[PDB]
């Protein structure tokens, strides 16, 4: 019933991203040190997890969005959210 969240952060400022699954939709709130704002991520799902890593100064984010038994990976690599190659054990 309650919304479900996932969070990641990078750097020392820091940057933070919080993903919320609410009524089948996952949205994103962002912090880079100057206030919270709404990010570009919008994808369907009831459950969400996230991980991220830096390559130098560039952030890479992977969001795992689940509905039923299907998990979709979404990828941020600097230029829009793209569907990743992740598949389950099937
Ligand atoms: O600067 C904000 C932004 O580009 O940061 C990287 C990702 O979190 C995006 O969804 C988000 O819109
Ligand atoms: O560049 C995207 C990608 O190759 O990044 C590593 C993994 O997240 C993969 O599933 C994904 O397709």
Residue numbers in the entry: 1 to 90
Quote the study on this structure.
Anionic calixarenes are useful mediators of protein assembly. Symmetric and chemically uniform, the macrocycle acts as molecular glue by masking the protein, simplifying the surface features, and providing a homogenous scaffold for controlled oligomerization and crystallization. In this work, we report modular protein – calixarene cocrystallization. Motivated by modular crystal synthesis, we demonstrated the possibility of interchangeable modules in protein – calixarene frameworks by swapping supramolecular synthons.
Cocrystals of 100–200 µm dimension and diverse morphology grew within hours to days in a broad range of conditions. Irrespective of the precipitant or the crystallization pH, all crystals were the same in the trigonal space group H32. The Gly33 carbonyl group is within hydrogen bond distance of four phenols, while Val13 forms CH−π interactions with a single phenolphosphonate. Lys34 is a linchpin residue (115 Å2 buried) entrapped by a phenolphosphonate pair. Structural differences in the interchangeable linkers result in different relative orientations of the protein nodes in the two structures, yielding different crystal symmetries.
